[model samples]
Target: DAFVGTWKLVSSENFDDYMKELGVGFATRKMGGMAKPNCIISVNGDVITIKTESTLKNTEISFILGQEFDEVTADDRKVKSTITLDGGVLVQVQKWDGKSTTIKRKREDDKLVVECVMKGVTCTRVYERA
Candidate 1:
């Protein structure tokens, strides 16, 4: 209930570094640096959907807690991921191409905190209400 709302990107930390760890190229990383995507989270019954909208890219993910399903990542990589909600935090683990990444999402006051981790690199993104 608390997280079901529209959120706009406010600030980011280590997002560029993490993408570099993911092997992103120069121009693309530059583009990603300037992009600020809006996130829309909706909770309906047993399903939760998060829509990321931006001029650079857009992605929508719908999943049920503890259920595994196919997902295409923002970089257009195909993967299988599962979502879990524990202690008021939403966690997602995705496996693709022999690698796995973990995403942790939690709300603090009116801000949405999202952490993306792969290998040993982690990036934090903060979003506020629009």
Candidate 2:
């Protein structure tokens, strides 16, 4: 599928505000905002792996479609995460501490578009095939 590839960050919008909605501190949010991470996505059978690499740190997560798993986010928050394929979009939902967020990834014109939503804040990150 088009989603299986290495994608480099091209642009990000409202990411800091989205992190703020998640209760991320100022220092961490600042560093996070400054980091442009490359996303590597792959699939083997029913399992899918998504890796985010940056100068700050690297985080990789593997999960089976439609199955929930425990995850520790880059910001060090523990959550339950699930990923599902809705048409051409890869949708991920993370929940922890009575809060939840959704991330959707889809291919648009040879680019990977990631949308992260929490509360009322929405962050859009676009990536080009690398």
Candidate 3:
């Protein structure tokens, strides 16, 4: 339940550089520059709900801790994402949106590994506690 509070994103595990690689629009990039996302997470039974709020928009995703589900993204695009625990890391697999699969591993010591995948492009960005 402690995750229910607001968590200010000190710095993304992979952002900034990742955005450049993704070819994000300049206007969108400008808007994203000042963002300090406040993520709110809630858990009920095996269900975990996450609300990642920023200046532009808020994204919400909920799923069973060990089950697969479609998480809706911007423009109403949906991505098949499943979150599970690999040891103490919260690992997630997301597919679709041109990216075949993305594996995100969040560690207990404020370390995160965000891996992006495509046809022949595979990149992993790591971030430590800020």
Candidate 4:
């Protein structure tokens, strides 16, 4: 699959602002801003797994396409998450406490690009296949 690979973060833009929009505290945002994480994605038998590895913390999630699941995000937010693939992009929507965010992951020229948006704030993180 296009997204089944290990990708290391190469660049990030406005991540702090996006986290702030998600109500992340200053301390967590500081650490989060400094983290360059690696993403490992895999698929098996209709289940997809996404693993995030970083010095700050490691997190993972597994789900079936179009199915909602309970997710505890790295920022410690418990959210209802649903992921679907559309137009070669993996779109994830998360809802929590009347708030919501969207994360879109797509492959561009052998690189993985992630866009995180919350309340009009958008952060872009780019990664190279590892």
Candidate 5:
């Protein structure tokens, strides 16, 4: 599967702004900004597992598409997350503390494009195959 691979960070746009909207503090965000993130994705049957590694933190998330599950995010916040596949993009919706956000991951031009939207701010992060 196309999503089953190791991806290294290429570029990021407005990531800090989005993190600010999520109430992430400056010191943590500074660390977050410094990390060059990588994602390793895998699929088995109906389940998908994503592992994100960076200098700041490492997180592994496993989910079944369309099924809701409780997740502790990379930022160490708890949320209810649900994932769905739309065409080539994997769309995820997360809700916590009466707030919600969306994340979409797709392959474009042989690179991975990740769109993270929260509180009217949308951040784009691109990743290339490693």
Candidate 6:
């Protein structure tokens, strides 16, 4: 399967401090305030590789079903502990010491809805194909 294309962010819910907690600077945060992330996901065997390209960053991560790995994204901008699953819910858990976030992704038509959660903050951002 292929999940590749430019995605426009139409709406967001519950995500405010999540981005700030991730150390997103003011300028970058301002930029992401109105940005569309281009996401791509590919599968091979039981492994799924995902790449999200955006105006600010392009990052990739891969993990097999019921598997987890540690990934340093953005060339060490983020040290993420990630896990993947294949079931009714598509969930990826990411954690760090001071800051952590869980990314949940699901498909709706040609659109992708990603919910990012951290501590008591939850932010939902939707992306539609361009």
Per-residue lDDT of model 2, residues 1-130, tens digit only: 8889899999999999999999999999989998989999999998899999999989999999899999999999999999999998999999999999999998999789999999999999999988
Q: Model 6 TM-score?
A: 0.75
Candidate number with the higher TM-score (3 or 4)? 4
Give me candidate 4's TM-score against the actual structure.
0.98
User: What digit string (tens of lDDT, one per residue) describes model 4 on residues 1-130?
Assistant: 9999999999999999999999999999999999999999999989999999999899999999999999999999999999999999999999999999999999999789999999889999999988
Q: Give me the runs in candidate 6 sitting further than 4 Å from their true place.
A: 1-8, 14-16, 74-77
- Sort by lDDT, best first: what order? 4, 2, 5, 1, 6, 3
Q: What is the lDDT of every predicted structure here?
A: 0.91, 0.95, 0.61, 0.96, 0.92, 0.70
Of candidates 2 and 1, the better by TM-score: 2
Backbone clashes in model 2: 0
lDDT of 1 by residue, 76-107 (tens): 67899999998999999989878888999999
Clashing pairs in 3: none
- Tell me the deviation in Å of residue 35 in model 3: 0.6
TM-score of candidate 5 versus the correct structure, residues matched by position = 0.97
Query: TM-score for each prediction?
Result: 0.95, 0.98, 0.69, 0.98, 0.97, 0.75
Report the lDDT tens digits of candidate 5 across residue range 65-115. Answer: 899999998787899999999997899999999999999999988899999
Candidate 2 has a TM-score of: 0.98
lDDT of 3 at 13: 39
Worst 10 residues of 4 by lDDT: 110-119
Each prediction's total of clashing residue pairs, residues at least 3 apart in sequence or on different chains, is 0, 0, 0, 0, 0, 2
RMSD of each: 1.0, 0.6, 4.1, 0.6, 0.8, 2.9
| Model 5 global lDDT (CA atoms, 0 to 1) | 0.92
Model 5, residue 28: displacement in angstroms? 0.5
Residue pairs of candidate 4 with colliding backbone atoms: none
The digit string of per-residue lDDT tens for model 6 on 17-74 reads 7667677677766776666667677778887787877777778888876665778765
